[PDB]
Ligand binder design. Structure first.
Ligand SMILES: *[C@@H]1O[C@H](CO)[C@@H](O[C@@H]2O[C@H](CO)[C@@H](O[C@@H]3O[C@H](CO[C@H]4O[C@H](CO)[C@@H](O)[C@H](O)[C@@H]4O)[C@@H](O)[C@H](O[C@H]4O[C@H](CO)[C@@H](O)[C@H](O)[C@@H]4O)[C@@H]3O)[C@H](O)[C@H]2NC(C)=O)[C@H](O)[C@H]1NC(C)=O
Ligand SMILES: *[C@@H]1O[C@H](CO)[C@@H](O[C@@H]2O[C@H](CO)[C@@H](O[C@@H]3O[C@H](CO[C@H]4O[C@H](CO)[C@@H](O)[C@H](O)[C@@H]4O)[C@@H](O)[C@H](O[C@H]4O[C@H](CO)[C@@H](O)[C@H](O)[C@@H]4O)[C@@H]3O)[C@H](O)[C@H]2NC(C)=O)[C@H](O)[C@H]1NC(C)=O
Ligand SMILES: *[C@@H]1O[C@H](CO)[C@@H](O[C@@H]2O[C@H](CO)[C@@H](O[C@@H]3O[C@H](CO[C@H]4O[C@H](CO)[C@@H](O)[C@H](O)[C@@H]4O)[C@@H](O)[C@H](O[C@H]4O[C@H](CO)[C@@H](O)[C@H](O)[C@@H]4O)[C@@H]3O)[C@H](O)[C@H]2NC(C)=O)[C@H](O)[C@H]1NC(C)=O
Ligand SMILES: *[C@@H]1O[C@H](CO[C@H]2O[C@@H](C)[C@@H](O)[C@@H](O)[C@@H]2O)[C@@H](O[C@@H]2O[C@H](CO)[C@@H](O)[C@H](O)[C@H]2NC(C)=O)[C@H](O)[C@H]1NC(C)=O
Ligand SMILES: *[C@@H]1O[C@H](CO[C@H]2O[C@@H](C)[C@@H](O)[C@@H](O)[C@@H]2O)[C@@H](O[C@@H]2O[C@H](CO)[C@@H](O)[C@H](O)[C@H]2NC(C)=O)[C@H](O)[C@H]1NC(C)=O
Ligand SMILES: *[C@@H]1O[C@H](CO)[C@@H](O[C@@H]2O[C@H](CO)[C@@H](O)[C@H](O)[C@H]2NC(C)=O)[C@H](O)[C@H]1NC(C)=O
Ligand SMILES: *[C@@H]1O[C@H](CO)[C@@H](O[C@@H]2O[C@H](CO)[C@@H](O)[C@H](O)[C@H]2NC(C)=O)[C@H](O)[C@H]1NC(C)=O
Ligand SMILES: *[C@@H]1O[C@H](CO)[C@@H](O[C@@H]2O[C@H](CO)[C@@H](O)[C@H](O)[C@H]2NC(C)=O)[C@H](O)[C@H]1NC(C)=O
Ligand SMILES: *[C@@H]1O[C@H](CO)[C@@H](O[C@@H]2O[C@H](CO)[C@@H](O)[C@H](O)[C@H]2NC(C)=O)[C@H](O)[C@H]1NC(C)=O
Ligand SMILES: *[C@@H]1O[C@H](CO)[C@@H](O[C@@H]2O[C@H](CO)[C@@H](O)[C@H](O)[C@H]2NC(C)=O)[C@H](O)[C@H]1NC(C)=O
Ligand SMILES: *[C@@H]1O[C@H](CO)[C@@H](O[C@@H]2O[C@H](CO)[C@@H](O)[C@H](O)[C@H]2NC(C)=O)[C@H](O)[C@H]1NC(C)=O
Ligand SMILES: CC(=O)N[C@H]1[C@H]([C@H](O)[C@H](O)CO)O[C@@](O)(C(=O)O)C[C@@H]1O
Ligand SMILES: CC(=O)N[C@H]1[C@H]([C@H](O)[C@H](O)CO)O[C@@](O)(C(=O)O)C[C@@H]1O
Ligand SMILES: CC(=O)N[C@H]1[C@H]([C@H](O)[C@H](O)CO)O[C@@](O)(C(=O)O)C[C@@H]1O
Ligand SMILES: *[C@@H]1O[C@H](CO)[C@@H](O)[C@H](O)[C@H]1NC(C)=O
Ligand SMILES: *[C@@H]1O[C@H](CO)[C@@H](O)[C@H](O)[C@H]1NC(C)=O
Ligand SMILES: *[C@@H]1O[C@H](CO)[C@@H](O)[C@H](O)[C@H]1NC(C)=O
Ligand SMILES: *[C@@H]1O[C@H](CO)[C@@H](O)[C@H](O)[C@H]1NC(C)=O
Ligand SMILES: *[C@@H]1O[C@H](CO)[C@@H](O)[C@H](O)[C@H]1NC(C)=O
Ligand SMILES: *[C@@H]1O[C@H](CO)[C@@H](O)[C@H](O)[C@H]1NC(C)=O
Lengths: 317, 173, 173, 317, 173, 317
């Protein structure tokens, strides 16, 4: 009579299709998804230090646009810029705006130390009606608009050494007056110039008489520039007019900080990986949510899905 | 496919086997039954877990990077920024596609291998007491009750006990 | 090489087999002949076509990119443009080299596997009626005419029909 | 007596060598080439819209060098620049020539809309003998050379708003006169300046008195600049001399367009993939024809050849 | 692991085998001995040398490249330079990790394969004169002195010489 | 009685752990290291032509700072800049210092041919006390500081054609005087300008009156610029003051040359691959010594170690 002994393997009624080297569709008993393709839609406030810019760009928080006053001296792992943001102080441009934004974002602090510059031969603290702070004409909190003293103006030559252990970041600028109604009113002469130098650097800037298109009803412009002053080094400012002067310096730090453009709301939750769409889990090795990421994130890939087999070939009964 | 067991000489899988990946079915005097093999099942599962451990929860931290979206037309420098990112993404997309494809071929083959090894080990255990029917089943040429079958599944089967009975049945006329 | 059949226990291939990749040669009372095996041949061909389908006709569109040739000396930005392109090309060149090398090892092994599977399947079919001569050939211990050989090639061979004849021939003195 | 049944496999008299992981030379029954290494030598005119620049660079077609007059308002998927091309109008340079070339190439159109600028206090349509159009002194078709009116010249202040849905591209420039023979003849004073601004941008440019080395026997130069004006925004030009003014704007588009340097002839044929050597087939996944490509192309790699086995190991008889 | 010989049906390796990678141990009337198999040993070694030849001494020359360290804060262009290099390094780091992991799986499997092939070849050589004990050892059912064992190791063993003796011993009671 | 024949494989008492696809720790009989992780600490002087900058940057060797006089006309495969280097001539800055450094490094030669410029209407060979050569006031060997002739100064207009087969590299600059003590002493007028042009290029530069912070006790600065003049082309210099003029040109070459920052000593030994830590062997395909390399080098990777199995699984007795 005898017996029969059969060797076999399992199978499931609901197999999954995976790809192989030889076969773009083969059914296995089980698989797991390697591409993260969903976000909750919220940027989690932990474990990274989030700073929501709200109505303020990093640059406006840096310059000190009055509505950004709450940002003074703050730090961040990630500064989040909102698309609804707008400037509401004196109109300005920044040649290489992207690099200033970048180096501040990366520094990851707005720590500012005031400095007492020897400003005699000029009226400090110039204001305007397009930069309203506390219901009164005002200016950028970190900038000092330098004008005449008794309709006269001599050659400035102010010096300031960096005896610290970190790089100093100085933000400064140039006024470009509207007409000759603002050429003889705030500076008291025909011509002007600004030369901001160090032991290793020199930038000079020529002002410009001319009306621009109005931005919040002001047709003049300011042009913002910057200067990094290393340890042991010195900042020198030769001015014969038009200087929008620093009131001090920003600390430059090195670390993991950055900036991201996103309209995602900030949630009270904990997620290592941030995209502009919101935070995402980082169990998977890949993701197709966004090429822009911050933190411990899966790597961005073009595929929606990539199934790894976690079971044998399914050969149903 | 590479060993020829799963979706090969084994015609199909067993949906009724829910407590293991590989196992044994038998017919003897006492009935027809099934039991899963734990060691081969676990051998397969450990290897798949090995692959998972290299892939799940292993991410890389990045912080400040380049900008990847632009609101102004700028030319040369923006071209380079986009190109660098597009280049990077294609290379990682390629890595991910190849990785999954190779892993999946390997997983399919190692699972086929585990089936094949169990089969082979069972064949050697039977010595001259059984013949291979070509479909994963052995014809056992002796009375082999539930304890005897169990002894084969547990690796304690003594082929000498039944050899006389089986040779007689095998080399009959 | 990995299964040990092609360029292993099979001494060489058959240039005279032109209608398949794998097959059978026989000597019996009625002469010496050859016939290709379609199923194993097609199994191999389908897998190779699978690989081809992922590789042939699958290209990626690119449009405006960076400049890659330069007529002026410029320094920093040009350095970065060249470096990015040179980096990219090395990574794709590496991808292509590895890809072909792996694909080719796999193709060689899967073809060896198909030979091995056919051999194994034929061995089991023969049960106790033949012995393995160690070179891909079976000594069949019974009169096996063209229809009988055909029955082995077609999977319809009934080993019970010849078992008595073959055991007698096998266990002679 | 019995029988013998041998299992075997085919072999071929002409095997091919391939590479593997373990073996840099192993013979298989068959292979196929994965690297495309040849072109027909012609750029196929289909399915991409080809625009052969012939004697004209994109920049010369853009500015409107008279021999490029046929290019007005044309579109392209691929603009092809020829090495035989040359300029034959007023000598000029473009700071960041590469970026202007790039952004126009990518925009993929020369669509130009004329605009009526309020030019009073100057003589428009200045010409020269080095820009011959239709056997008569002429200038760049898209530029308006602004000179005096009755040996006098006041402060210009012309404005032009963008109420369209697309970015406007404005091309303009500055003249740099040869001597004081061309300082008191076309502008009628000692000094000059150009300030081309928007709500978000400002460029100012100072002219230069001085002879340059002659280029087609003219020693003066023009310097070309550009300005993008977004929807809702305004272009303003403050000029006190020397303005080479726009006659309107170019449409900026986004799409798949580009530019390529090649001397390959254009053929009447259909090929998805274009290189500078000519079109190439794109059946193969790789190519070593050129790192410069346009369209659906194989990826560039350094190898001449890469053979994929399509058969078993060849073990001849 | 994929063939089931090394760390499978062969319980362990032999530290006392120093003149080859694979070999034979025997017990016969004349004592207990060991001899290495050169052909299987060399088959394994050649394949590993093949892999080494693609990897050792194959480097790529580069000359002027981009700067990769910076003493000043600069912003946009420096961001792109660092990002390009960091991107490149991650992709090569990935290539190196995957390469080693695959090579090592393949090396382990091909060495297991060589053991399996030698075993299989020896089994076929023995024909009906031995049985597989399931642990890499064959029970030889005939007097097999040192010359006889040597004849099996050298591929000159004539199974017909001993077949009568062995069938008698095998199919005894 | 019979016999027993066992098939087996070797094992070793001291296995090595490797990684696989399925297993992060598996013991094999043997392995070899694929990551080079050590240097001898010396940059080998062969087979690449090494030029140790010692106290001199490439830029200082280029300009001809007196202590760099030994570098005149030298070639290099690799110029090595030392961190102890310092400038000891007239204080200067180079806008785009990095690009000049880069293109010279890549050119791989300091070959300089003197040229006789028609300098009449000025005193050549101006010197200073902060550039001491051979115990006497001096200047940069490759620059000619142009000052007045008998307290007067006319409009310069000097021309120089490139009839060679290679690009000419011209280094030149602008003086920025300290006060009006150095505005009426060396140039003899109120204002100045420099315009260095070709058939295809034009750079103009305005000088600046103003004291900078002292660098080796000099408060003036020079600003260094460059101009490449192709075959068939011409260099033109319009000067009305302040020109720091070329004394000739540098040969531009193309080849394999570069520059590296390192404090590693130069040894008498032979190694293809150079890092800043010293030379390294290049038997291995990967290395984690430095991302900066020159020559035939292993590729940089983040891993310390990567063991390739060169033996079977070790299953000890
Ligand atoms: C098809 O194939 C997949 C993969 O092999 C199987 O899914 C795995 O199943 C196991 C066990 O059920 C899961 O283990 C659990 O992980 C949880 C961690 O949560 C997240 O993190 C992992 C990665 O670490 C993510 O992949 C995952 O998506 C989760 O979001 C733990 O919290 C669990 O712990 C609980 O149970 C254990 C009991 O062992 C206790 O020790 C704990 O106290 C706790 O109660 C648990 O460890 C594993 O995460 C799954 N992996 C994936 C990738 O999804 C499927 O089961 C399989 N399907 C079938 C039908 O077999
Ligand atoms: C060695 O190995 C290779 C690859 O396995 C074999 O070459 C293949 O052979 C098949 C069949 O002979 C070819 O199929 C044909 O493809 C044509 C498409 O033309 C181009 O596009 C392909 C990719 O799609 C390119 O790779 C190729 O170079 C071509 O330039 C079709 O037009 C053909 O159609 C015609 O025949 C079929 C009959 O099946 C009809 O249906 C049609 O109406 C029409 O008449 C055909 O389908 C395949 O392209 C080849 N591949 C490659 C990569 O070259 C060799 O045959 C093999 N050598 C040996 C000796 O076996
Ligand atoms: C564990 O695994 C590894 C790799 O398989 C083995 O190491 C190899 O062993 C061989 C033979 O002992 C070595 O071969 C020798 O190479 C020397 C070249 O020197 C350098 O270059 C190689 C690459 O080419 C580097 O990898 C290496 O680190 C060296 O720094 C030659 O100079 C030697 O030549 C001498 O011997 C031969 C005899 O064959 C003579 O022809 C010559 O005249 C001369 O006297 C020799 O060829 C090989 O370099 C090693 N490779 C690696 C990567 O290290 C281990 O042996 C193995 N361990 C065990 C216990 O088996
Ligand atoms: C951030 O700003 C929003 C948006 O409203 C701003 O729009 C600008 C164009 C400008 O007109 C500015 O004055 C205005 O505030 C603020 O919401 C508005 O806040 C004002 C405050 O007086 C209210 O009167 C409005 O009801 C309210 N409107 C909307 C649509 O929200 C918002 O308060 C401010 N948030 C922060 C955190 O500063
Ligand atoms: C490269 O310079 C070193 C370092 O010393 C330099 O430090 C500068 C800040 C400046 O003060 C300069 O004068 C000085 O040379 C040279 O070493 C020094 O050489 C001087 C030469 O008079 C000796 O008096 C010192 O003893 C010596 N000091 C040290 C600490 O080495 C060095 O000679 C020179 N090398 C070359 C190749 O030019
Ligand atoms: C601008 O200010 C600086 C600093 O006060 C002046 O530089 C100093 O000048 C004296 C000579 O008058 C030197 O002895 C000092 O060593 C300098 N000090 C420093 C700290 O550099 C500079 O001269 C001023 N400019 C003008 C035009 O007077
Ligand atoms: C996350 O946001 C990105 C960017 O906004 C989304 O991708 C864009 O989707 C819109 C609408 O479908 C398209 O018009 C854009 O072209 C897309 N941009 C890019 C760069 O892909 C993406 O769909 C969002 N993903 C998730 C999961 O919400
Ligand atoms: C240059 O032109 C613009 C536009 O005509 C002038 O700006 C206008 O000036 C009046 C006051 O004179 C404002 O009330 C308008 O709102 C402005 N219009 C626009 C559209 O901005 C500008 O003043 C002119 N410049 C000079 C110096 O007169
Ligand atoms: C396609 O054209 C490219 C670029 O002109 C060719 O590559 C050049 O070949 C010339 C002459 O052999 C060399 O001097 C250049 O150094 C090469 N340049 C590059 C970037 O490789 C290429 O040979 C052509 N290919 C085909 C198939 O015609
Ligand atoms: C600056 O120098 C150049 C070269 O001497 C002058 O250009 C030449 O001028 C004459 C007419 O006076 C032309 O006929 C020549 O063809 C020019 N020669 C070259 C080589 O270009 C230029 O005019 C001088 N500048 C001034 C203001 O006199
Ligand atoms: C080779 O030198 C590099 C660069 O100096 C070393 O890497 C640095 O090590 C220091 C000290 O451990 C760290 O502070 C830096 O952050 C490291 N820099 C980088 C870019 O990694 C490296 O350790 C040296 N390697 C060897 C083998 O000597
Ligand atoms: C410091 C100073 O002079 N501020 C005055 C400004 C400037 O003159 C112009 O903004 C420069 O163009 O003009 C105002 O009308 C204004 O904008 O509110 C009044 C303000 O007191
Ligand atoms: C608008 C105008 O004034 N055009 C005149 C120009 C310019 O004066 C110079 O090109 C500027 O340097 O000079 C010409 O000799 C010329 O080149 O043909 C005559 C021409 O009528
Ligand atoms: C050519 C010339 O005039 N050289 C003189 C310079 C320059 O006037 C200033 O360096 C320019 O600011 O000044 C010196 O005091 C000096 O530095 O040694 C004397 C020197 O003879
Ligand atoms: C199959 O169905 C079961 C029961 O609902 C479910 O738990 C399992 O996840 C499914 N598996 C797959 C691979 O779809
Ligand atoms: C075999 O193992 C099972 C499971 O542990 C056990 O319950 C059973 O009694 C064993 N049977 C025999 C016949 O040894
Ligand atoms: C086997 O199959 C072949 C091919 O289809 C057929 O012609 C032949 O008659 C069959 N032979 C036997 C013996 O069944
Ligand atoms: C071998 O020769 C035949 C007959 O000419 C040809 O068709 C085939 O392509 C060749 N194959 C290879 C792999 O070279
Ligand atoms: C087998 O080969 C060995 C090694 O070459 C040889 O010395 C021995 O004499 C041979 N033995 C037999 C039995 O043929
Ligand atoms: C093991 O020890 C021997 C003897 O000292 C040595 O030569 C060998 O390199 C070691 N092998 C490994 C893999 O550690």
């Amino acid at each position: 009579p005898g017996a029969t002994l059969c060797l076999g393997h399992h199978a499931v009624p609901n197999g999954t299709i995976v790809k192989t080297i030889t076969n773009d569709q083969i059914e296995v008993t089980n698989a797991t998804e390697l591409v993260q393709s969903s976000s909750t839609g919220e940027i989690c406030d932990s474990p990274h230090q989030i700073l929501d810019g709200e109505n303020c760009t990093l640059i406006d928080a840096l310059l000190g646009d009055p509505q950004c006053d709450g940002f003074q001296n703050k730090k961040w792992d990630l500064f989040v810029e909102r698309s609804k943001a707008y400037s509401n102080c004196y109109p300005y441009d920044v040649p290489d705006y992207a690099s200033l934004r970048s180096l501040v974002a990366s520094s990851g602090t707005l720590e500012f130390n005031n400095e007492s510059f020897n400003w005699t031969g000029v009226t400090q603290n110039g204001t305007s009606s397009a930069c309203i702070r506390r219901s009164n004409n005002s200016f950028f909190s970190r900038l000092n608009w330098l004008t005449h003293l008794k309709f006269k103006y001599p050659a400035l030559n102010v010096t300031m050494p960096n005896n610290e252990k970190f790089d100093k970041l100085y933000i400064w600028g140039v006024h470009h007056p509207v007409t000759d109604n603002d050429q003889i009113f705030p500076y008291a002469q025909a011509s002007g110039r600004i030369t901001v130098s160090t032991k290793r650097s020199q930038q000079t800037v020529i002002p410009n008489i001319g009306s621009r298109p109005r931005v919040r009803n002001i047709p003049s412009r300011i042009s913002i520039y910057w200067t990094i002053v290393k340890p042991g080094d010195i900042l020198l400012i030769n001015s014969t007019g038009n200087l929008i002067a620093p009131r001090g310096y920003f600390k430059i730090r090195s670390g993991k900080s950055s900036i991201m453009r996103s309209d995602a709301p900030i949630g009270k939750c904990n997620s290592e990986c941030i995209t502009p769409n919101g935070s995402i889990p980082n169990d998977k090795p890949f993701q197709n949510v966004n090429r822009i990421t911050y933190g411990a994130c899966p790597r961005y890939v073009k595929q929606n899905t990539l199934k790894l087999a976690t079971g044998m070939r399914n050969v149903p009964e | 496919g590479i060993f020829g067991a799963i979706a090969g000489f084994i015609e199909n899988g067993w949906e009724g086997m829910v407590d293991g990946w590989y196992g044994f079915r038998h017919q003897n005097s006492e009935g027809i039954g099934q039991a899963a093999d734990l060691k081969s099942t676990q051998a397969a599962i450990d290897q798949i877990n090995g692959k998972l451990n290299r892939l799940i929860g292993k991410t890389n931290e990045k912080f400040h990077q380049i900008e990847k979206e632009f609101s102004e037309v700028e030319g040369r420098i923006q071209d380079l920024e986009k190109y660098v990112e597009d280049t990077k993404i294609d290379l990682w997309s390629y890595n991910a596609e190849l990785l999954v494809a190779l892993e999946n071929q390997h997983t399919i083959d190692l699972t086929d291998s585990e089936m094949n090894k169990l089969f082979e080990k069972t064949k050697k255990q039977l010595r001259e007491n059984a013949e291979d029917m070509g479909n994963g089943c052995f014809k056992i040429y002796h009375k082999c009750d539930n304890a005897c079958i169990g002894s084969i599944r547990n690796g304690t089967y003594d082929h000498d006990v039944y050899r006389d009975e089986a040779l007689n049945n095998r080399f009959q006329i």
